[PDB]
Amino acid sequence: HMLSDEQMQIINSLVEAHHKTYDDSYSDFVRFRPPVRRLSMLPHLADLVSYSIQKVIGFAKMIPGFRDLTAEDQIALLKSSAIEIIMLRSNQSFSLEDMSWSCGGPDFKYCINDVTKAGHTLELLEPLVKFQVGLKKLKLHEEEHVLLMAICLLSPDRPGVQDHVRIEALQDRLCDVLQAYIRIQHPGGRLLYAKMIQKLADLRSLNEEHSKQYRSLSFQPEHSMQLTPLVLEVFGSEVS
Amino acid sequence: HMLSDEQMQIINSLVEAHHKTYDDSYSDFVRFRPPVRRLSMLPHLADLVSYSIQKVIGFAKMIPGFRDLTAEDQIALLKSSAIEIIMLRSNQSFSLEDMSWSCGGPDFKYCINDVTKAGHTLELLEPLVKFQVGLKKLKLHEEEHVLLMAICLLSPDRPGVQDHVRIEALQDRLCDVLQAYIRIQHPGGRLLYAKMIQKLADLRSLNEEHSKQYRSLSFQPEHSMQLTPLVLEVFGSEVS
């Protein structure tokens, strides 16, 4: 009926870690290769994703216990989940009014058509945008948003993980926190927890579709040469 | 005493190939990650070099006979010589008045200090700038500039080449052309040919120093991650 002292600590450090790795001013975006509207948007969006992967690694390293995993498991979890955390964290710039991601300036406003010009089809972009509006309607508390990112990252059902028992226990503790938080602190959220777990399921499907479309891009060197070294390493298929 | 018909053909196709791969408007530079003046200039300069490597590959493919080499030799020659062709072709933007490369706008004006902020020391930048002013004073004809780039690229004394005999014969024919051109068409150039061959020697020394300093950058992943996939492939040490 009331959040434990250790549960709120988990929340505090997750919230701080998110504020430390998500810049609401988006001022860093000017450093990316500019947008062009072939695949005219592939250079800017590749820089956007690469920058975001660095943020997700920074967030991950501040989840309680993630750092104490082996370096192999840390990589396994990041390589499988990175695109999912990006889709999740991007909800913070998504707008229902424009059905797009608005990152400050109009040059950093990304329509669906912008993403197609980066090598992606409606097969991915249709369910991605539906995922964003539905996640947006949930009206998540900041505490809930960050817990969902952390739960998604700490999934033991990823290819490559070895310490299944440890990762599951971490993820369990995070779900208990989320469930308690919603119960105590979110009025009218008796159905929210289930809805959020459903969004995790949607992310697996978006991940699958993104992986398929990334694969075709990376098999064409005139496109893959536009990617960054971090993108190719993280979304690549090498195994540690 | 007069240029043969086949010698001028070589000149014509080299000149055209250079005009097709060198844009005097520099308008493409706005697509690079912007300059910042750590290694604040490493992203822009890495994009500059990557773009330029593509131009050198385009130039190379139009040298008579280069395309008829094996794909291995073409790569061997490009991997060893690429940085030398870039230093040579950059003379076209170098200015004696500013001791810098001026590519149109002031944001694309590169001082010595700009290059240090990309991870390079005066060990390289001192002889590089001296190389530029001296090559600039030669006042090369366009025909001579392009022949020197082609002779530099077709050197058989590169690590990795296998068809030594073929490449040397190509390079021989190009030197004969250069020697004849200077004799017939360059008044007061009785000493120019030797001077140019000396500049090729200077390029080997700049190449060595650049390779040493590239190596230390590429061993630090926080810097190497800023490079592009083409840079890492061409300046990398993998062997075909």
Binding site: Q54, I57, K61, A71, Q74, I75, L78, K79, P229, L230, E233, V234, E238, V239, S240 | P221, E222, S224, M225
Partner: peptide, 10 residues
């Protein structure tokens, strides 16, 4: 393998 990731993971 994963040179950059290792670096980023400290």
């Amino acid at each position: 393998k994963h040179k950059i990731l290792h670096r980023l993971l400290q």
